[PDB]
């Protein structure tokens, strides 16, 4: 009930600054004046087919938790973003009989329809050596390749699978389950 007037607010006091060294040698303030421009050596990493993970011979479809279905395939978008290569695993562990897919044999316009206007999606068309772009389902692919890499993504506005520059980026993944 009693209201005692408190004083105005001010900044807490601060210690004074330390003195600034004039006796510095300058030669030791910087380093040795001779400098070499930096050079980097990136560890090349060849990409082979995972073999451990491949096209499943089984049929399944989690009818209650699939992203979108079309004809004889069910399509899931991984909720957690993953690496491009690691998604080979990420599709198998998601649901039974699910695997990394290459979209154009199914026609990707539907996939690109079910995306936002900024979100990307790793897709499963690759090239092991310097040959054709292929998927686990096989065949050849037209690809908008602009980088040397082997990985590919799609976006809302994508017309064709697009090669990516760094396959270590985290993005969701397109996984498929068969019904045949």
């Amino acid at each position, epitope marked *: 009930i009693t209201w005692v007037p408190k004083p105005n607010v001010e900044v807490w006091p601060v210690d004074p600054p330390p003195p600034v060294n004039f006796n510095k040698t300058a030669e030791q303030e910087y380093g040795d004046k001779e400098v070499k421009l930096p050079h980097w050596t990136p560890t090349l990493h060849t990409f082979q087919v995972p073999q451990n993970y491949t096209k499943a011979n089984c*049929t*399944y479809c989690n*009818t209650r938790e699939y992203t979108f*279905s079309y*004809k*004889g395939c069910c399509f899931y978008f991984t909720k957690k973003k993953h690496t491009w290569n690691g998604c080979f695993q990420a599709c198998a562990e998601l649901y*039974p009989c699910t695997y990394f897919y290459g979209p154009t044999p199914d026609i990707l316009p539907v996939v690109t329809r079910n995306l936002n206007a900024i979100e990307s999606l790793w897709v499963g068309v690759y090239r092991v050596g310097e040959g054709n772009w292929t998927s686990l389902d096989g065949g050849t692919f037209k690809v908008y390749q602009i980088f040397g890499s082997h990985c590919t993504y799609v976006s809302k506005f994508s017309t064709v699978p697009v090669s990516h520059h760094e396959c270590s980026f985290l993005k969701p993944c397109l996984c498929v389950s068969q*019904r*045949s």
Partner: antibody
Amino acid sequence: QVQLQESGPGLVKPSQTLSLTCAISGDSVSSNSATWNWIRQSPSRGLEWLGRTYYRSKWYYDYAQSVQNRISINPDTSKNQFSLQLNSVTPEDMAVYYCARGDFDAFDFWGQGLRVTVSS
Amino acid sequence: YELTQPPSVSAASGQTARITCGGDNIGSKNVQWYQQKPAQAPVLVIYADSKRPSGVPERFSGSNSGNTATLTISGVEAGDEADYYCQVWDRSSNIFGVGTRLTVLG
């Protein structure tokens, strides 16, 4: 030669439990690329798919809305057959029951189908 | 989800018969056509819109587009008088057709 035949009691009293079993031959109940479905046909309800079961990594069972809390479909790997149980049956359940093979979309090969009537 | 097929269709013996099945984006799904002759168990006559099971007359054919799926029987001979049902799978539901009774005139 893929074939399968139904069997079980054809008469069930009101409330009560309905039990049926379909024995298959020419294929495996543990098939990796199939599903085993129970489907009933009645003039009142048309052609309604009751349920299905399959085996991949584990045994999975899928059921329809009209009998979600009442249906159970259990297989048997030994006799290569699969059963169907429907508790709390009503006169609406009077129908001809078939079993069939399928692949999630289509239902390939059907059973002979047995008529189940309810009237106490 | 809503499979609408004509209650009855008629055709003269020899002329091509057409049975239709409508629904929202049925062209995005795999339509199956089953034939049930009177007093018989349903038998798959067409699957995957156009694919035919082994041992089905080539007169039976199927198409799927947008909101219409058509099952065309070119021969229309004997034994074709039956009830034809379309079947699709919208999410967690197998939707069967109401039923199209085929009448073989002539």
